[PDB]
Amino acid sequence: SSLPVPYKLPVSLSVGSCVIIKGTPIHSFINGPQLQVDFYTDMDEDSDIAFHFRVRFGNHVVMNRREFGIWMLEETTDYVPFEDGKQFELCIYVHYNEYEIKVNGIRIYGFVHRIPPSFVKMVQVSRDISLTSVCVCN
Amino acid sequence: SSLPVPYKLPVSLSVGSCVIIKGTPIHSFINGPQLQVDFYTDMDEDSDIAFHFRVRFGNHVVMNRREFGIWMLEETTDYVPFEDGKQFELCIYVHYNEYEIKVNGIRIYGFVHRIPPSFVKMVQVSRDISLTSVCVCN
Ligand SMILES: OC[C@H]1O[C@@H](O[C@H]2[C@H](O)[C@@H](O)[C@H](O)O[C@@H]2CO)[C@H](O)[C@@H](O)[C@H]1O
Ligand SMILES: OC[C@H]1O[C@@H](O[C@H]2[C@H](O)[C@@H](O)[C@H](O)O[C@@H]2CO)[C@H](O)[C@@H](O)[C@H]1O
């Protein structure tokens, strides 16, 4: 891996920002690897989370937020077009209303803001992946 | 322009970071356009500047830093391989010792750190350019 995992990147996001994460799962899908991305409101890992994204590869994706320390209503989707053993490209685009989530160019979900994305001060990429690059674009 | 100019982007830089700026001069070279990039230590434009980069297109590049509010010893180079009227790509790579500056893939200079690059909290892109994209990569 080019970057350490868990990878905690201080960020400032606004509408129009784009988070691009490139990496590879470190296990085959029959071994149940996961990939987690958290849009944290501070560097402390107990802080509130504006957007939590957790892929169980070849299985499903769980999404949520954490407000006042409490997990809210979980959202999910079965569309997880990652490929076993291959590098992936995960793009999270900050729209005025939602985060649009693309997996290898394929839009899979829009997670609607319950707090403004400018509250996000850190992005953490974690679990069973090797990280090639993380880029924040405007 | 896709982004407003002057463009002030809050950032957190470390060794291995890469700032990629894509844009076009808004005047032809006989009209003396300039492009300025400042690696500021805070959002206030009077704060200290770890790295100041000022291109007079078709002419020369001035580089400096500002410490305790005082401009230090100016550095310069005559190599400015920008093309009249064309989009450029300016990459600033944060090495452990220096910022390596590439213009359209061409390394033109290495500005050595006099304060650690982790002191940089804002990048400002300014003057006579239209801005297509700014990306911070790791
Ligand atoms: O919602 C994301 C959040 O879920 C936690 O696990 C949940 C679990 O998904 C749910 O099925 C069960 O009923 O409650 C658990 C805890 O509230 C994870 O612990 C957490 O890391 C997030 O992934
Ligand atoms: O050094 C960068 C800094 O220069 C200022 O202008 C200088 C000028 O380049 C120099 O030739 C003259 O002798 O002193 C000036 C001020 O110290 C710019 O004003 C400033 O914006 C930076 O570009």
Residue numbers in the entry:
A (entry chain A), B (entry chain A): 2 to 139
Anything the authors wrote about it?
Moreover, in the crystal, Asp33 from one monomer occupies part of the ligand binding site of another Gal-13 monomer. In order to eliminate steric hindrance, this aspartate was mutated to glycine in several variants. All three other variants (R53HH57R, R53HR55NH57R, and R53HR55NR57RD33G) co-crystallized with lactose, but not Tris, even when the crystallization conditions contained 100 mM Tris. This indicates that these three variants prefer to binding lactose. The present results showed that double mutation of R53 to H and H57 to R was sufficient to recover the ability of Gal-13 to bind lactose. However, the pyran surface of the galactose residue in different structures could not be totally merged with each other, and glucose residues showed variable conformations. The conserved tryptophan and histidine residues in the three variants showed the same conformation and position as in Gal-3 and Gal-8N. Arg57 in R53HH57R and R53HH57RD33G showed two different conformations. Arg57 in one conformation could indirectly stabilize the pyran ring of galactose through a water molecule (W).
